[PDB]
Amino acid sequence: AYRPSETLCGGELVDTLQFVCGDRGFYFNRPASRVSRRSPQRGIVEECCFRSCDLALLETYCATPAKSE
Numbered sequence: 001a002y003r004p005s006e007t008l009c010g011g012e013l014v015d016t017l018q019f020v021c022g023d024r025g026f027y028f029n030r031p032a033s034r035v036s037r038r039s040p041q042r043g044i045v046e047e048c049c050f051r052s053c054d055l056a057l058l059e060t061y062c063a064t065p066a067k068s069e
Contacts, residue, residue: 006052006053006054007048007049007051007052007053008048008049008053008058009045009048009049013044013045013048013049016048016055016058017044017058017061017062019055020055020058020059020062021059021061021062021063021064022064024062024063024064025062025063025064026061026062026063027043027044027061027062027063028043028044028045028061029041029042029043029044029045030043030061031043043061044058044061
């Protein structure tokens with residue numbers, strides 16, 4: 001269903017990632033590299049700020065596996 005806050009950006013997006021994943025860790029742009037920050041690879045921002053997303057879509061960026069069992 002529609003949410004008035006179906007988009008997030010900046011710290012809002014980080015806070016929601018901290019909520020679904022815990023402070024245990026999450027990816028933002030899944031870079032898996034540390035060579036520089038001259039490479040703005042696409043990620044969660046494009047799905048949640050430049051587009052709308054749900055907590056469930058957002059949870060796919062967690063740096064830990066699902067443990068609902």
